[PDB]
Structure 1
Amino acid sequence: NWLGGLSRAAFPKRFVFGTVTSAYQVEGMAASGGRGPSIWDAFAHTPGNVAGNQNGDVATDQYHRYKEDVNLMKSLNFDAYRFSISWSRIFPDGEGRVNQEGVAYYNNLINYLLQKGITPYVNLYHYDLPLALEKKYGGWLNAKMADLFTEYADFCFKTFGNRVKHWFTFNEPRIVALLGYDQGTNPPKRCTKCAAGGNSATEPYIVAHNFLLSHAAAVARYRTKYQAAQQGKVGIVLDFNWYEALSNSTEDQAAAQRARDFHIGWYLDPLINGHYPQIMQDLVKDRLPKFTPEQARLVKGSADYIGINQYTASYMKGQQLMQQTPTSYSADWQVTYVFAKNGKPIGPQANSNWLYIVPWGMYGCVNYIKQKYGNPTVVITSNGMDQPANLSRDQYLRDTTRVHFYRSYLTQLKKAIDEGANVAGYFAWSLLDNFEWLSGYTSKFGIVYVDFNTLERHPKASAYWFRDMLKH
């Protein structure tokens, strides 16, 4: 049947299903309601940076329409909603003066969600550093971010935490490090070649270290000041795409494992075990910052659950490990990407070139975390695929590839859970077609279509699929 045997009964009791957005991608009102600019506002307003020179000034205008969108997600039988708070909408300069109008918006959103029986899962940060902090402090290159982020987090805990019980600090710090400071294609556009400056061999590691230290500091503040009264939880969201050895050779299996360690272990080994992966210590050496014993003890165990954003999988081919002049975080892995095996592609691509449709990658990732890291509580915090630009409304709505995508990926997640993986929830990226970063409005990830001329919402076939699967 079109559900393929899936329903709430096929998952654990009290398993959480939700949808996901982020502030800059859906809110709009980017320069209104008292919001200060983020590094993404500056980046997107520069000609050439985003597809079609588009930006998030208006986006889906969820700022004005949030009750429509909450009504819709309730009608589709979701239990929860993952969204982010824009740091610069609360603190336009990232520190100092509070924008009360911004505070009121998130109060209103949170209160309506609760009124409608949808649990808020709230991210503090989703790529959108206040531009003032980038300019004044140098953003995530500066260890002072720990203090700056903790003060912002403290405000959010105090202001919203009597109602919000499920927090995340960051979203995919690996992607910030990779695209912001290795390749230099996302803000602040730093890299060895880059006009803005940078060093692709050192800066990604500095940035990741500062995310880990800031996460740990924010959680320490939660636990020492707020947790007794509020009784909520705080985690982090990490991307993890699967790596499969191209062959059973020792060198191909070692390559796939190196890729896992440089991708997810970079954050998970510190968060679970209190140190960076051994292979990273061995290869990156003095370019990898060292936690002091005290810092390592603050980072270890500092995530109450691990959010995983899972989309795709790649084959990995190995090589003899060589002594090499450092060039970049990416080159440090000493692996070779491969997208076919035995003459067959690993899967077909969605609209995004990096997004190969590989449902068994979901099982791969979840099983791996279960087996390697002592089966921590995991929440799938994003999973989904995109349609291309320029389709007709009805073409967007008949999204049979996305229906197949969710049925297959959820069957694979179910397989892992039935084998004992401690997965507590699953969140579809995205509730709505939205501003997809460098792709702007040319990539459509939503289970709900948004007409970007009229701003009208129309649920796609995949939205009705969820509604059917999730009925109580």
Structure 2
Amino acid sequence: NWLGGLSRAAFPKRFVFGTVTSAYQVEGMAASGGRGPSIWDAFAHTPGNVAGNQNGDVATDQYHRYKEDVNLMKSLNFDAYRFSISWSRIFPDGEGRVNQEGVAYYNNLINYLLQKGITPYVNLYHYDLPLALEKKYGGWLNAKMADLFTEYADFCFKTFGNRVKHWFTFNQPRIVALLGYDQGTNPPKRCTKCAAGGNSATEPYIVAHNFLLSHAAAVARYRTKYQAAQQGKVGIVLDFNWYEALSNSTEDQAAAQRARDFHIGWYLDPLINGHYPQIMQDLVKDRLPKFTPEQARLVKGSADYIGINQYTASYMKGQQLMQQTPTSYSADWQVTYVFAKNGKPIGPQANSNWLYIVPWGMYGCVNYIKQKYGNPTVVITENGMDQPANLSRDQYLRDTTRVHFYRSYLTQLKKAIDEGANVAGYFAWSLLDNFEWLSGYTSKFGIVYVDFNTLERHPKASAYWFRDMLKH
């Protein structure tokens, strides 16, 4: 059977299923309704930055259509919806004056969700730093971001927190650090060679440190001011792809473990244990900022749950560790990526070149966190795959590969949960085809097809798969 034995009965009582979007990727009205620009508006409006010179000005127009989209998610039997608030739609300059029209939108969206029995899971930040803060403060390079972010979070808690009980601060700070400040391919386009300036060896570490301090400060504000009355939770969303040793050699096993530590441990060791991974301290040395005892104690235990975005897996090959002139965060790991073993690829690729379909990576990641970090409450906050550009509507709708993807990945998630992993929920990326950052509209991740000419929504086979799997 096409469900392959999956249903709500196959998961724990009260396990949460949802779909996910992010503000810039779906809302549209990017320069309307009082919204100020983000670093993504500026970046996407520069010729050559995004596929087809596309941008999120209109995107899926969820701003106008949100009731349609909520009706659709309810009809597909989801329990929850993860979306983000655009900082610059609330505070067009990132601080100071509140855009009341922006506030009204999120009130309307949250209220409709609740009216329809869909639980809002709300991200405060999803790459979309207000342009004004980038220009005035230097963005995430500036330790002052902790104060600026805390003040924004405080406003959101006060304004929405009587209704919203599930918050996330950040989405994938690793990718902000990597793409914004190591490779310089996402805004602010910083790197050692980059026109904007930068230093691929130092800035990714400064940026990560500031995300951690900002998360901790926002959570401290929630707990001391709002939580007694509101009784909600705040976590963080971190990407984690699985790393498997290419062989059972000491060097390959060490390499895979180094990759895990530089990828997820970078954030989870501070959040769970109050320090960076030992290997990162050993290899990165004075380029890795030091938490004071007070900061470390603020960061430790500051996530009520850990969101994990899980997509893919790689093999890892290792080498003797060597003294080397620092060049970048990526090069600091001293590992070699490998995508085949015994002459067989680890899995076929989706439309995105980085996205290898490897369902057992889901089990890898979930098991690893359970065993290493004392089984923290985890929520799978994104999982999904993409179709390419230029298909016909019907080809988009017959998304047989995506159906297989969800059945296989969720089977592997079920295996990990059945072995005792503390996973509380699962969210599909994405509800809708949307603006996929550098890929623009050339990458289709949705379980619902969006015709980008007419803006019409049409559920794909994977949407109906979820509907069948999730019927109550």
Same fold (TM over 0.5): yes
SS in 2 for 1:169: strand
- Structure 2 CA distance, aligned partners of 1:128 and 1:382? 18
- Structure 2 CA distance, aligned partners of 1:14 and 1:228? 24
Alpha-carbon offset, residue 338 of structure 1:
0.3
Q: Deviations over 1:90-111 (max 9, x none)?
A: 0000000000000000000000
SS in 2 for 1:129: coil
Aligned-residue CA RMSD in angstroms? Answer: 0.1
Counterpart for residue 133 of structure 1? 133
SS in 1 for 2:93: coil
Alpha-carbon offset, residue 41 of structure 1:
0.1
Alpha-carbon offset, residue 201 of structure 1:
0.1
Q: Deviations over 1:195-245 (max 9, x none)?
A: 000000000000000000000000000000000000000000000000000
Alpha-carbon offset, residue 375 of structure 1:
0.1
Alpha-carbon offset, residue 462 of structure 1:
0.0
- Structure 2 CA distance, aligned partners of 1:281 and 1:308? 24
Alpha-carbon offset, residue 19 of structure 1:
0.1
- Structure 2 CA distance, aligned partners of 1:302 and 1:125? 17
- Structure 1 CA distance, aligned partners of 2:275 and 2:337? 27
Q: 4+ runs of 1 displaced by more than 6 Å?
A: none
Alpha-carbon offset, residue 262 of structure 1:
0.1
- Structure 1 CA distance, aligned partners of 2:162 and 2:88? 22
Query: Are 1:45 and 2:45 counterparts?
Result: yes
Alpha-carbon offset, residue 406 of structure 1:
0.1
Counterpart for residue 101 of structure 1? 101
Alpha-carbon offset, residue 288 of structure 1:
0.1
- Structure 1 CA distance, aligned partners of 2:466 and 2:434? 19
Alpha-carbon offset, residue 315 of structure 1:
0.2
Alpha-carbon offset, residue 345 of structure 1:
0.1
- Structure 2 CA distance, aligned partners of 1:110 and 1:261? 37
Alpha-carbon offset, residue 419 of structure 1:
0.0
SS in 2 for 1:200: coil
- Structure 2 CA distance, aligned partners of 1:229 and 1:297? 24
SS in 2 for 1:424: strand
- Structure 2 CA distance, aligned partners of 1:47 and 1:347? 34
Alpha-carbon offset, residue 309 of structure 1:
0.1
Counterpart for residue 423 of structure 2? 423
Alpha-carbon offset, residue 22 of structure 1:
0.1
Matches within 5 A, 1:61-460: 61-460=61-460
Alpha-carbon offset, residue 71 of structure 1:
0.1
Alpha-carbon offset, residue 275 of structure 1:
0.0
- Structure 2 CA distance, aligned partners of 1:336 and 1:225? 47
Alpha-carbon offset, residue 290 of structure 1:
0.1
Q: Deviations over 1:344-388 (max 9, x none)?
A: 000000000000000000000000000000000000000000000
Q: Deviations over 1:43-85 (max 9, x none)?
A: 0000000000000000000000000000000000000000000
- Structure 2 CA distance, aligned partners of 1:319 and 1:382? 32
Q: Deviations over 1:14-40 (max 9, x none)?
A: 000000000000000000000000000
Q: Deviations over 1:146-170 (max 9, x none)?
A: 0000000000000000000000000
- What residue ranges of structure 2 are gaps of 5+ in the alignment? none
Calculate the TM-score normalised by the size of structure 2. Answer: 1.00
Counterpart for residue 471 of structure 1? 471
Alpha-carbon offset, residue 393 of structure 1:
0.1
Alpha-carbon offset, residue 313 of structure 1:
0.1
- Structure 1 CA distance, aligned partners of 2:246 and 2:235? 33
- Structure 1 CA distance, aligned partners of 2:440 and 2:361? 27
- Structure 1 CA distance, aligned partners of 2:195 and 2:282? 31
Q: Deviations over 1:271-323 (max 9, x none)?
A: 00000000000000000000000000000000000000000000000000000
- Structure 2 CA distance, aligned partners of 1:432 and 1:321? 44
SS in 1 for 2:308: strand
Q: Deviations over 1:170-198 (max 9, x none)?
A: 00000000000000000000000000000
SS in 1 for 2:424: strand
Q: Deviations over 1:435-455 (max 9, x none)?
A: 000000000000000000000
- Structure 1 CA distance, aligned partners of 2:118 and 2:336? 44
- Structure 2 CA distance, aligned partners of 1:152 and 1:185? 27
SS in 2 for 1:327: coil
- Structure 2 CA distance, aligned partners of 1:433 and 1:423? 26
- Structure 2 CA distance, aligned partners of 1:293 and 1:372? 23
- What residue ranges of structure 1 are gaps of 5+ in the alignment? none
Alpha-carbon offset, residue 268 of structure 1:
0.0
Q: Deviations over 1:98-153 (max 9, x none)?
A: 00000000000000000000000000000000000000000000000000000000
SS in 2 for 1:303: coil
- Structure 1 CA distance, aligned partners of 2:369 and 2:277? 14
- Structure 2 CA distance, aligned partners of 1:169 and 1:339? 33
- Structure 2 CA distance, aligned partners of 1:140 and 1:406? 35
Alpha-carbon offset, residue 414 of structure 1:
0.1
- Structure 2 CA distance, aligned partners of 1:130 and 1:425? 30
- Structure 2 CA distance, aligned partners of 1:345 and 1:411? 21
SS in 2 for 1:266: helix
- Structure 2 CA distance, aligned partners of 1:171 and 1:465? 27
- Structure 2 CA distance, aligned partners of 1:311 and 1:92? 33
Alpha-carbon offset, residue 460 of structure 1:
0.1
SS in 2 for 1:390: coil
- Structure 2 CA distance, aligned partners of 1:375 and 1:337? 28
- Structure 2 CA distance, aligned partners of 1:365 and 1:375? 12
- Structure 1 CA distance, aligned partners of 2:230 and 2:341? 51
SS in 2 for 1:224: helix
- Structure 2 CA distance, aligned partners of 1:17 and 1:251? 39
Q: Percent identity?
A: 100
Aligned length: 472
- Structure 2 CA distance, aligned partners of 1:197 and 1:345? 38
Alpha-carbon offset, residue 89 of structure 1:
0.0
